[PDB]
Each structure stands twice: as structure tokens, then as C-alpha cells.
Design a protein around this ligand. Structure first.
Ligand code: AV1
Ligand code: AV1
Ligand code: CL
Lengths: 250, 252
């Protein structure tokens, strides 16, 4: 597993590009400058064995980097990276974590500590599975927590309803572990979009299975809940990529 | 009265670095110049000059250095349809657009201009689009499009608005007509037009008539193949996602 070349420059270049040119009208700028953000990000992991982290390690970084997020616009997703993002349309319809400053700066990057200079590795990172969960999930787990914790109003959750393996809702997923349970009383509703992949056996439906379980969690948290299976707007997006699928019939 | 981008250099450098290490890795190749070199090349093109003192050759050195090889059959040119083309091209998953290339990606949306005084460029103001001569205002994006078009191979796609009563699909003076079409080379084998007809609007342009027919004849005179389609289903579905109730989006 190969860490990212010149992490600092990449970090700082994204940070700066975001700062001046990205999400201008969609999300707010952040107070701390880009060098400040690097220091907080890098103190979390540097000069330590790669597994030497926990859920607190990147705390300062997420405090510094948390943006206020617009009412009613925040989205969560499980198992449907590409569809949730095509449909969230780069901040235009919904915010996703990847549109936010920390999400955007670290999206897809790979990096790890080493005890010895220069304090991070530049040849190899260990397999996440080798590290305790709280080190494996230190970074994206707390990123999820901070994002969820800032949401207000309606939130939207896009799931996979077409996977026999992974059920739609799961306590053990990142939405299950860090997001749904960090939703504050500023949240008024969870609106689930169930994604049913085209030409594939339908697994989870609203009102059933894991989607029932979540309905119950959502209500137990004092939120309103709704759930829709392939709403026309999403359906269409799925249909541009497989136009002959029966589901897209004219 | 137009406001330039703050920290131009830092923005350039940020985007160039981001791009190099992380963008389009499996889709477009890296250039050999490093970011600082490409900046030098960019900067000398317009610095220490009248904001309006620029011609089609000013950025020649920057583009030579910045030009990637483009993959067979994936290049796309667009007219009057920014969002739709780029959504359809889907970040180089389906087609490449200028905006996915290195110079496109670094400079997209940025606003800049030179000044004869220290320090070579203006950060306060940049002139009204319409003051400078055609050759000077189109100096950066004109050459960008020439160079991109010059690098295209195989079958190119051209996505056009066919619902604009004021602007024909094909025009000798658009970017396509002026800079892309004339720089298509022997590497190119076919031009594939996609006419986009906006939902709930009068259809204005059709394959085999008007300016499209003119295009067909120009393309064939250059010994390239030609097709043209109107609202192909995959594109239609894209429009339909933004306007699901539109008459044209009926199912079953
Ligand atoms: N371009 C990309 N950039 C980044 N990642 C990409 C990617 N493409 C893919 Br493909 N992933 C993958 O998605 C996998 C885990 O997600 P999941 O199982 O689908 O769902 P969750 O557990 O609920 O976690 C998601 C929730 O927390 C974050 C956000 O708030 C969201 O709501 C990752 O391990 C990647 O491999
Ligand atoms: N977000 C953005 N960021 C930056 N710029 C944006 C922009 N959004 C727009 Br909208 N433009 C501008 O729209 C102007 C003219 O486009 P046009 O009138 O629709 O068609 P053409 O004259 O035939 O030129 C098309 C060719 O340009 C290169 C590409 O390969 C394509 O083939 C462009 O010059 C942009 O400045
Ligand atoms: Cl199909």
C-alpha cells in the first residue's frame, strides 16, 4: 500500500484551491489559514508507529476545519459512492462530506506515521486491518462525526437496496458508527433514498429489514423519517448510464 | 469592471500540484515540466504588458509544455452547453473535455491580466471583456482550444445547443469553428455531433439542415467521417434528472 507523493504540497494545494475558487456560494470559508490546518493535521499522526492513533488524534484538525453546513442540504451515503455524488451534483443539490474542506483535502489520499524522520512513511503503509479499529478509523471516522454533528434540518441518506451481502442500513457502517448517532436535535428529519441498481434483484425495500430497523432508530432519536425507492430524478441518472435497462422504458 | 483571482500563482500551483499527483491518473498522462516551470511559461506570456497586448501566440510556450497526449476517441468539444456536456462527459469517465486537461483544469474560471508596471500583473482590476481586440481576449482560451484540438485522435465528439434561436449549432466564428475544427488533424477520423434540445423549448437545429448541413460538408471535405444525433437517450436522461416532469420524460 503506497502513500501519496508529497503529501504536504498536495494538502496545501487542495486547501488553497478550495479556499479561493471552490464552493464559494455553497459553503463558507474557514478561519484558520492553510498552514495552520497542515500543523493540526500533521501533529495527529507524525512521529509515531502507523497504528498509533485513536478517535481523538485528528480532533483539533476537525475543529479548525469544520464549516457551518447549510440547513436541509446535508447528505450521507452508504455503498453508493458514485450515484450519491452524481446526484448531489458538487454542492448544487446536496452537500456531501467530500464537498466539505477536510473531505475534499484528504479524499483518496493515503498516508501514515513512522517514528523516524521525516515522521511519515514514503514507501509503504500497513494494511488498515492490522491496526486497531480506532487507529484505522481515526481519520474518516472522526471526519464523519464532525460532519454529522454540524448538520441541521432535513438530512438525506442514500443506500444500496441491491446488495444481498451488505444490507441497506447497518450499525457497523460509517453512517451506523459515526453519523446517525451524532445527529443533533437541530436535525428535524432523515430522508432515506433507497437505490435499486438496474437489472439487479431487489433486496431491501422501505418498511422492511434493515430499513425498518433504521426507521425505528430514526424515530427513537426523535426525528421524522421518510423513504423512497428510485425517485424519478435518481432513476434518470442511473438510466443515462444504462439506457436499455427495462427500468428506463419509454 | 472585472475582478481578478486572488493569489493567482498560489492558485495555479495548488491546482497543478493537485492535478499532477492525484487527478485523472488513469485517464490522462502527466506532463514532464514541473509546476514552477509551467508557471514561468504562463506568467511570461502576459506579464509586463498592457492587459490588452496579447495575440494568438502569447501562450504558445505554456501550451507546448502543458499539452498532454489525449486518448483515442474520448475528446469532446462543446458549444453553449457547459453543464450538460461536462455532466455527460462525467469527469473523463466517458469523454475528456478541455476542462479535464492540465491547462484547462489549472485555469478554468480564473481571471487575470498583465500590467506594464511592477509587478507585471494586476490584482486590482482587469479590463472589460469587450475592450480588447478579438485576438487578445481569445489569446489564452483560443490557443488552449487549438492545442487540445491539435492533440485529439480518433473520433471526436461535439456537443451543441440546438434550441438557441440566436446562435447556430455551428458557427465559423465560435471556438469550435475558429480554433477546434481547423486544428483537427490526420489523427482524427470522425466528428460525431450531439445536438442537445433543451426540454420544453422549440427545437431549432436539426441534423442535415441549416448550419449542421454546412458542418457535415466541411467535415467531409477534410476526409473525416460524420454522424449527428439529437437527444440520444443517455443525454436525454441527464436532462430529465433536472426536470423529471418535463413532457419529454415519460415512462411506462
Ligand atoms: N472516489 C472515492 N473517494 C473516497 N472513497 C471512495 C471513492 N470511491 C469509492 Br468506491 N470509495 C469507497 O467508499 C468506502 C466506504 O463507504 P461505504 O461502505 O459505501 O458506506 P459508509 O460506511 O456509510 O461510509 C461512507 C460515509 O462516511 C463518509 C460519508 O459521510 C459517507 O456518508 C471507502 O472505503 C472507499 O473505498
Ligand atoms: N465555468 C467556466 N469556466 C471557464 N469558462 C467558462 C465557464 N463557463 C463558461 Br459558459 N465559460 C466560457 O464559455 C466560453 C465560450 O463558449 P461558447 O460560446 O458556448 O462556445 P465556443 O465559442 O465554441 O467555445 C467553447 C470551447 O471553449 C473551450 C472548450 O474546448 C469548448 O469547446 C468559453 O471560452 C469560456 O470562457
Ligand atoms: Cl443499456
Amino acid at each position: 500500500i503506497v502513500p501519496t507523493r508529497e503529501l504536504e504540497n498536495v494538502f496545501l494545494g487542495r486547501c488553497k484551491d478550495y479556499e479561493i475558487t471552490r464552493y464559494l456560494d455553497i459553503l463558507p470559508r474557514v478561519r484558520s489559514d492553510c498552514s495552520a490546518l497542515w500543523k493540526d493535521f500533521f501533529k495527529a499522526f507524525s512521529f509515531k508507529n502507523p497504528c498509533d492513533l485513536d478517535l481523538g488524534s485528528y480532533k483539533d484538525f476537525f475543529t479548525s476545519a469544520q464549516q457551518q453546513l447549510p440547513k436541509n442540504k446535508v447528505m450521507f451515503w452508504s455503498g453508493v459512492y458514485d450515484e450519491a455524488h452524481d446526484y448531489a451534483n458538487t454542492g448544487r443539490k446536496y452537500i456531501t462530506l467530500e464537498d466539505t474542506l477536510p473531505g475534499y483535502m484528504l479524499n483518496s489520499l493515503v498516508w501514515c506515521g513512522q517514528r523516524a524522520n521525516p515522521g511519515f512513511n514514503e514507501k509503504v503503509c500497513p494494511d488498515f486491518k492490522t491496526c486497531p479499529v480506532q487507529a484505522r478509523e481515526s481519520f474518516w471516522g472522526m471526519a464523519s462525526s464532525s460532519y454529522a454533528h454540524s448538520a441541521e434540518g432535513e438530512v438525506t441518506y442514500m443506500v444500496d437496496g441491491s446488495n444481498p451481502k451488505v444490507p441497506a442500513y447497518r450499525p457497523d457502517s460509517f453512517f451506523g458508527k459515526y453519523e446517525l448517532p451524532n445527529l443533533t436535535n437541530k436535525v428535524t428529519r432523515v430522508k432515506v433514498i433507497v437505490l435499486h441498481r438496474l437489472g439487479e434483484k431487489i433486496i431491501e425495500k422501505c418498511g422492511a429489514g434493515s430499513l425498518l430497523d433504521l426507521e425505528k432508530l430514526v424515530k427513537a432519536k426523535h426525528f421524522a423519517f421518510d423513504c423512497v425507492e428510485n425517485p424519478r430524478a435518481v432513476l434518470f441518472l442511473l438510466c443515462s448510464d444504462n439506457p436499455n435497462a427495462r427500468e428506463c422504458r419509454l
